[PDB]
Amino acid sequence: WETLREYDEIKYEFYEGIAKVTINRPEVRNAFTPKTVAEMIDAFSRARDDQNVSVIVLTGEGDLAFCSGGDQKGEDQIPRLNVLDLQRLIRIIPKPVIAMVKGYAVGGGNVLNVVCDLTIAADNAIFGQTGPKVGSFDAGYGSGYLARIVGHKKAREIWYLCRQYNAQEALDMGLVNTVVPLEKVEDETVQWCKEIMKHSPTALRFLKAAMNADTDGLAGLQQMAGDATLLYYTTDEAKEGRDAFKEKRDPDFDQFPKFP
Amino acid sequence: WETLREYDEIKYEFYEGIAKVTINRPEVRNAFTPKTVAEMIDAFSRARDDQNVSVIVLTGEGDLAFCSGGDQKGEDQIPRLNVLDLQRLIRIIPKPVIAMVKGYAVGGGNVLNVVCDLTIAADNAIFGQTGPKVGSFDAGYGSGYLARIVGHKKAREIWYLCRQYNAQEALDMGLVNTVVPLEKVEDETVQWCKEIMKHSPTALRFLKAAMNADTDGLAGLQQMAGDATLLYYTTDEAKEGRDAFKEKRDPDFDQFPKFP
Amino acid sequence: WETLREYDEIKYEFYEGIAKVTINRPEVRNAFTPKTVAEMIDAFSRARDDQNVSVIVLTGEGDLAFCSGGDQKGEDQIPRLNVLDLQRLIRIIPKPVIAMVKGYAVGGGNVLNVVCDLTIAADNAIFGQTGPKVGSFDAGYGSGYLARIVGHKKAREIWYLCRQYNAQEALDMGLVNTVVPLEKVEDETVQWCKEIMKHSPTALRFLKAAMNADTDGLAGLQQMAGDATLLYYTTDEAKEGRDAFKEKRDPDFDQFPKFP
Amino acid sequence: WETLREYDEIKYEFYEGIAKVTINRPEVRNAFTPKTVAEMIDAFSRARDDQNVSVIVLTGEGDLAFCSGGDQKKIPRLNVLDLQRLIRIIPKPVIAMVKGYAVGGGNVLNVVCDLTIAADNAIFGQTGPKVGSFDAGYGSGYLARIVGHKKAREIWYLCRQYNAQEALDMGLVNTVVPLEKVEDETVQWCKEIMKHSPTALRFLKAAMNADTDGLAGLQQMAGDATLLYYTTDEAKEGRDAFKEKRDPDFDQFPKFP
Amino acid sequence: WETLREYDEIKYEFYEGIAKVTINRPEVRNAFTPKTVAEMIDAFSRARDDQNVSVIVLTGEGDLAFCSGGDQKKIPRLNVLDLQRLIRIIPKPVIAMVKGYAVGGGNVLNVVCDLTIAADNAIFGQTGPKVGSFDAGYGSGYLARIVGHKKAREIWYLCRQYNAQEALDMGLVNTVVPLEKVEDETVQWCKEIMKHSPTALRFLKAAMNADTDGLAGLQQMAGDATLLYYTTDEAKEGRDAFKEKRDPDFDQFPKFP
Amino acid sequence: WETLREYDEIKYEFYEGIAKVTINRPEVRNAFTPKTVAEMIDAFSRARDDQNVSVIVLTGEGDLAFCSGGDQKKIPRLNVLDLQRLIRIIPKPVIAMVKGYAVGGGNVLNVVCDLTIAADNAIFGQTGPKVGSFDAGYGSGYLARIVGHKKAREIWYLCRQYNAQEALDMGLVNTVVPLEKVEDETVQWCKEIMKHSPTALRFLKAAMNADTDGLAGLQQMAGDATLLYYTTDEAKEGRDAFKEKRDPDFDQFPKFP
Ligand SMILES: CC(=O)CC(=O)SCCNC(=O)CCNC(=O)[C@H](O)C(C)(C)COP(=O)(O)OP(=O)(O)OC[C@H]1O[C@@H](n2cnc3c(N)ncnc32)[C@H](O)[C@@H]1OP(=O)(O)O
Ligand SMILES: CC(=O)CC(=O)SCCNC(=O)CCNC(=O)[C@H](O)C(C)(C)COP(=O)(O)OP(=O)(O)OC[C@H]1O[C@@H](n2cnc3c(N)ncnc32)[C@H](O)[C@@H]1OP(=O)(O)O
């Protein structure tokens, strides 16, 4: 059952192509410190680069929890908010990020959940925002992007009233993808991933970047461009342009197929 | 049961922190004239300023109706369309606006419903657009913003076919938040409001402005900025900047915590 | 049962105000070649102009299929991708375009389905994207616009896992408008259309352009502008502006009603 | 020569179709207060309604000054934003006539107005970061869509002062004239606008807002779209059939492609 | 020197990779009609398909004129918009060669084209609000994203005429040359473009549109993305496995971060 | 005079609040590599954290050069984009000090930085379409929001070189000075910024990004919004009530309209 790489507050493991970032703080119910986030960013950064991995999954250690948010009940000392760096990271990574929620995903923990491409929910799961009850709020991806899933009314609902939502309430609003019994959530998530690795990783990275460019204006278009520049690089045409530079002569795009 | 402030075609009342704007034209089934809208704008403007109120609710007088739209079956005389001024107002107000629909919310009446942050629906409620049957249309918030709740297909549906939608059909598409029996709709709405007043009014005003900035481009960002400028005003740093102006000397932002 | 206009791979028919574009390639399960698309574009272009038609419907020949996508199992010879020209066309046409799916709507076939204003689904229908399984993807309207119906999570789902979705799964996510037994799908769609032709065609063209301007930034606003310029043209004010040009004298917008 | 309806902290005037809103606080370099803004909101709203008003001009009292922001010396929350928002929902063109210092929330007002005519002694710039505020709304984003991001980021970061000619070359102001001719020119501009159709004008205005204000600017464009729709015979007959309790017949009205 | 395929109201020519669309109605100052636009839509679509065409130029017949809008003298609905839309979905650079009056829907056409080379006798401006129309689409919003909102609001509100140098300083045109050298320069521009890669060009073009056209401009960017994807070995093998009725093996193809 | 923490392919320095990132590869005209970019990402991230750093300057080693893109001579995927993205999420103003050739992905870097101060010998332009790449992200769209679409489409299509004064008139650079005074001026700019409040600065920076970066730029604006919220007494008391296991009392804290 999956290998492992050295971390203090998180777990970074691997199963047959899947990378698994796990929040390993069940005592505090998987709440993150600045160090925790910094470890997650590092873990994802390595997951992005490793050619062996095709799909990433984010989850909590045991049952009962996925993530809680902050706490203080950081290191540096400096009031960091690197939580937001991670938010951006998982959705620029040209690999699907799946949230395997197996309990409470509340506050900051839920925002990490919504920013993940897909969500596998255990029947045990409870979703919600706690910000305005705990003197906080995620007004970025936690608000705008949430509306882009559930509809404005529901997003307005979960932030204002701050209620809890069971797996079925989450499924019924479209927040989560499937709900499976707690025992089966370690499976199913793998079945999902196994289903992705059948498909072209390059087609998936474009579609991910296309979905980001839908919402993130000119920051999302950057990702689309970078994947384009990457594919364009691999074309015989581009080779000619950089060969002519090393050959100090003029480029000859004379005989190359021009598509209407 | 709630106090009151002087109005001719609407009712402006108050219950334990809640302000209640009521369309008082049940004879014409709560349709608005230019005067009605002008009263509603005034009522909301006062609701925005009054430090005693935390949540606003919009509703119709008795049962059977929430709102119908226009009529002519205005004052000035001048063909006003101030209906749109109100639309903008309720969503710049740093207080949640809840639509307590207790019957027909059709035509212009439904657009007022959708622009309200949350919607409490009585089982009695019927929703729809009548524009293209009555030689009209709301192509602004009535179209674009509607899609941002129900999905484009459903928004396209309700405008083209102009069908009626019962409380459950409304709930199933995500248009409304909850459906409660007609007898209980005066409650529940209060329970909702009572639940908001537990949370930080400042966190809520930012989240509201964040949800507007999601859709309203640079007009929504203005609201976000204004709330920022408001909170920045309250910080010791800002005080120093305006003190130095009244003291005619140079500002000293030397010893103030700089966050990464 | 409906007349007809000359085409090789598609059918262009007419019923009491409804135009019916039919993909006539059931042998290949209604997959399109470049010629097929070019015929569809022509058909729609004629449907746009013909004052007799009020609503357009897109569908496949027999049962079992709506559309499959590409194939090669074009003419010119030139690798065309005119599929995208059609995508833009049906949503600039000032007439509702209804997708009458009576079977498989997969791959490119589903994208044509989602771009259609409304969708009438037969119980027989199966929806899905096959791109990353067949070395392709629609990262434009197939990704972004899809999220604007079903929510990001579901759009992310159907592209990454590439699963099939039955009529009810489609209805439950909001992708399709209604589901009716296969026998009744030729009706119902007509009932829908008959319901549109009761309403003002001009109010509908604005609302369509308003829904496009919601998502398509400055390309959608063009459509809104063009409909505006069209209605403004019909006003006595505009007449005066162009009369003064033909009369070589100065325009007199002196006595014309100015609305606040 | 100019007809008046008075206030306490502003001046409100009419001249041959032109309505002129004037800040009347030169001693404090024409700075606004909560109250001064409230008066402007009112005067603009009245100008919105007046059928004889076709163009609105915002100006300072004498020379030397136009607007130097909000002074705070007279819990203060911020209705300048409502005014900015208002003065671009007015279906009437509004021209900024700057004849001195236009700084802080005084400059953002200049920016928000459709066009700016500047007397040669004009001074443009921000104070925000030095005085304990900022205009992160139209003061920042919208300024970039006039001046360009590189230059818009400049004015906010350095808070320097810019003379009339510098404003012209970056693109902040439309025109620059001598101080003596600035009461004129503006009237010429107004005279030139008033001979074009107010409806086409109000639409283009909405089209410019919709380009940037997203869905809120769309409401403006659509709002003026439905007004034109009201005036058509296929619209009124839709409303008449409802009044007469019968099915509407749009059937015989010219279609368009 | 220039090879021709003819029409009734336009001229369509080829020269060493350069295709030239020319309005052929100088008597009415090169104004378009429904028919004239239809011809341009066709000629552009043919230019879209021609593998030997790398750059497109839009110009007027002689000097004096380029385009003065739609005359209406020959129910008229408005296909100019389809043409505007078309001439920015062409994966080929299109340069406006203006040698006289470019006004009304004639100026918006100039605006829509990627670049504008101007002969020194060029005159730019709008007529809309005076003649009973407006271009609230690319005529308004897109013009602001070239000229800046302050100046874009100017040209529509006042409907004044602007000489070549004024257009240059606000940023409307790329370059200004003497009338004699305007047939040249444009060819030089074309010659310069034709030596760069057409694929990188078509992408940047789509990136510029996507920046402003929202989701529609995204379709363009993505559309060119999937074309490049078609030409890769991991794409064709995906399509081949479908044809051969077996499971696709993308497994051994280089990954990227 | 300047204090150093070293790397292999860059230089990283501090001077009275100013941190200076310098590409240290003049032999290849200051071109970056995957590694050189990684170093810059690190150095910027360190500058992000340093409480004593208020302004960041990006520059080339000597004169003649600033950045000429990515050379590729030393599967290469493209972390320059991460750096571009990073250097606009830094709540600190970053100024491009260009003293030579700024071309290709070297020019886009210049563009991404908030402001550009240019030595008179500066040369700006793109190489993409000729060398087998393009910057369809901030290189294209964002460049238009500085220069204007007409001119932004020019630089990419023709790939010409532009001197310092030409960059100034189109609006690419903020200021132009003699080469000798470019180490100065930049420091003056920095000195001028460092006397304004860092919080108002970081907000305006986020407001400028949010204007263009859509929902991602919104995250930045909101992120700085919640930081200010943390420092308020009604926020901490919300967090304290959670720690103390009791119901929060926001009830007695001043409200705003
Ligand atoms: C900048 C930042 O850092 C903040 C952010 O922006 S992110 C948003 C902040 N979010 C929050 O504070 C969420 C509040 N937490 C909750 O609501 C939790 O669900 C809650 C404690 C009720 C836990 O629910 P639960 O299942 O009933 O667990 P419960 O029985 O209450 O408590 C178990 C332990 O979890 C800890 N815990 C759970 N969530 C926590 C959190 N977010 N912070 C700190 N501790 C937390 C509790 O303190 C408790 O620890 P102890 O045994 O030492 O007292
Ligand atoms: C610019 C503008 O002003 C217009 C706009 O943009 S807003 C859009 C305009 N909307 C409309 O016109 C909606 C049309 N109204 C409806 O469909 C109503 O539901 C409708 C009259 C059927 C009422 O439904 P109902 O429950 O069956 O009530 P019903 O039995 O029909 O009639 C009861 C009374 O309500 C009145 N009424 C209801 N809605 C009305 C409306 N919108 N305008 C005028 N009168 C209305 C009816 O005229 C009737 O009055 P009388 O007794 O004097 O004849």
Ligand SMILES: CC(=O)CC(=O)SCCNC(=O)CCNC(=O)[C@H](O)C(C)(C)COP(=O)(O)OP(=O)(O)OC[C@H]1O[C@@H](n2cnc3c(N)ncnc32)[C@H](O)[C@@H]1OP(=O)(O)O
């Ligand atoms: C640029 C482009 O052109 C491509 C694009 O961008 S659009 C996206 C491309 N999409 C696809 O390729 C979709 C793949 N097709 C499918 O998945 C089909 O549903 C699929 C063949 C399984 C058909 O499902 P089905 O109901 O079981 O039909 P099935 O029994 O498998 O086969 C029946 C016939 O349909 C044909 N067919 C169905 N879809 C086809 C397609 N997309 N292309 C070619 N042939 C297709 C099969 O080849 C078969 O023909 P034969 O009898 O000559 O072998």
